[PDB]
Structure 1
Amino acid sequence: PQITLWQRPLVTIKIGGQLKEALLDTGADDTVLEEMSLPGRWKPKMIGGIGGFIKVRQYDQILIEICGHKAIGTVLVGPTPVNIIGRNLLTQIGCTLNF
């Protein structure tokens, strides 16, 4: 589809049997979701954005469904105010910026 930016580009994602709302964020290198439970081992990581850094838990090889498109990648879980789909997953669904 083609998404205009008059409003925030929010989409429904399916992860770990859960349906959630997330922002398609071209300004984010990684994908970060609000606190939740995911299977497997995880490692600590610090990510920085506007305002400073936050501590998150890194999970690798996580399957996420974005608008029907299956994508595999690293997902960070932590105290983010909004769920963010970053570039590591946007590339997998063939998402591009056009003007």
Structure 2
Amino acid sequence: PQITLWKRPLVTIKIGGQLKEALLDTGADDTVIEEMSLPGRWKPKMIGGIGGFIKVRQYDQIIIEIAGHKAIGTVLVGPTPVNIIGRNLLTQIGATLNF
């Protein structure tokens, strides 16, 4: 698909057996999802942006489906105001910015 940027580029994802809405975010290095449980090991991390830092749980080797495209990678879970698909997963679905 070609997604214009007149509005937020929101898509449906499937993660941990749940459907969620998430933002395709070229400005995010990593993928950050609101509180949920995921299987396997995790380690704490701090991530920062406008307004400062939040503490998240880092889960590695998590399978997501992003607008129908499967990809595996690290997912950060914590008190993000929006679910964000960051570059670590955007690369895996072949997403590019074009102009």
Scaled to the shorter chain, the TM-score interval is over 0.9
Q: How many residues align?
A: 99
Shift of 1:29: 0.2
Alpha-carbon distance in structure 1 between the residues aligned to 2:17 and 2:54: 26
Q: Note the alpha carbon deviations across 1:25-48, whole angstroms, 9 max, x for none.
A: 000000000000000110000000
Runs of 4+ more than 3 Å apart: none
Alpha-carbon distance in structure 2 between the residues aligned to 1:76 and 1:26: 16
Please report the RMSD computed on the Cα atoms of aligned residues, expressed in angstroms.
Answer: 0.4
Shift of 1:65: 0.1
Q: Note the alpha carbon deviations across 1:54-79, whole angstroms, 9 max, x for none.
A: 00000000000011110000000000
TM-score by length of 1: 0.99
TM-score by length of 2: 0.99
Alpha-carbon distance in structure 1 between the residues aligned to 2:73 and 2:97: 21
Alpha-carbon distance in structure 1 between the residues aligned to 2:60 and 2:97: 26
Answering whether residue 40 of structure 2 is matched by residue 61 of structure 1, we say no
Structure 1: gaps spanning 5 or more residues: none
